[PDB]
Amino acid sequence: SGMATIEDIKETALIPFQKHRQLSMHEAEVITLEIIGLLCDSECKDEKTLKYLGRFLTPDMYQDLVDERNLNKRCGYPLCGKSPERIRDPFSMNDTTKKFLLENNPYAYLSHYCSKFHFRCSQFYQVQLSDEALFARTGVHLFEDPEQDKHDIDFKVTLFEELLREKASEEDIKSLIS
Ligand SMILES: [Zn+2]
Numbered sequence: 001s002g003m004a005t006i007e008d009i010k011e012t013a014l015i016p017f018q019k020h021r022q023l024s025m026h027e028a029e030v031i032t033l034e035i036i037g038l039l040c041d042s043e044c045k046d047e048k049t050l051k052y053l054g055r056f057l058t059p060d061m062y063q064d065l066v067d068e069r070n071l072n073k074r075c076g077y078p079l080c081g082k083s084p085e086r087i088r089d090p091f092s093m094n095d096t097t098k099k100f101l102l103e104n105n106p107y108a109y110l111s112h113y114c115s116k117f118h119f120r121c122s123q124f125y126q127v128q129l130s131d132e133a134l135f136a137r138t139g140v141h142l143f144e145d146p147e148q149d150k151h152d153i154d155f156k157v158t159l160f161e162e163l164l165r166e167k168a169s170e171e172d173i174k175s176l177i178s
Contacts, residue, residue, distance in 0.1 A: 003045040004038045004078075006052045012038055014141050021139045028135035031056065036065050041072045043081045047159050050078055050125070054157035055140040059129045066112060066122065075114040077122040085110035124160035 013034035017027055035056055044050045057065070066076035071090070073083045088095040088111040099108045109119035134140075140151045 001045065003043055004049060005045045006049050008038060009035060009049070009053065010143060014143065017141055018143055021142065023135040023138075023141065025133075025135050028133065031141060032061060032134060036061075036068060039065060039078050040068045041074065043074075044078045047079070047162070051157050051159065053078070054125075054129055055137065055151060055155040056134055057129050058131055058133065059126050060131075061134075062126045062129055070112055075118055076112045077118040077125075079121075080114055080118050082114040084112055085114055087111070121160045125157060128157050130155065 013031050017023060017031065023031070035053065039053075044053070065078070069076055069078070070084060070088075073087075074080070075082045075084060086107060095111070098105070099111065102108065106116070109116055113119040113122060130137075137151075137155075139145055139147050140155065142148075145151060
């Protein structure tokens with residue numbers, strides 16, 4: 001399918017460091033660019049992968065990912081395979097000016113995402129990410145993690161569309177079956 005799965009992430013980035021619980025600053029780096037290499041031109045298979053992925057990212061690294069997706073002409077949100085609605089020139093000061101000058105204009109997000117909806121999903125995700133550097137997150141890269149359950153909770157991420165779902169009414173629910 002060409003979509004990143006939790007297994008792709010484990011095989012393509014994590015394999016060479018199942019020797020130690022504690023990563024070097026350099027190792028975390030390698031791991032980082034390996035994941036972003038995986039998600040820069042392709043998308044997450046599903047919400048479980050995007051959620052799993054949170055262990056490995058800081059808000060800033062996610063920002064970088066959104067920028068490199070956009071560069072490869074892709075919606076900032078890693079689950080989306082569409083392109084942004086409006087193009088922007090990274091070296092253009094006009095384009096940079098527009099994002100902040102224009103007051104409550106769609107340009108600001110439609111230049112990074114396919115829609116406001118995915119802008120929201122991307123930002124809802126991002127602000128939950130830890131500022132702790134990856135190498136400081138001892139063990140979160142280990143396949144058979146002795147603290148798997150603990151890391152699952154410490155780096156829990158709730159997706160925006162998980163909250164939207166959770167509130168739907170019975171009348172809403174019923175429509176889908178028919
Ligand atoms: Zn999108």
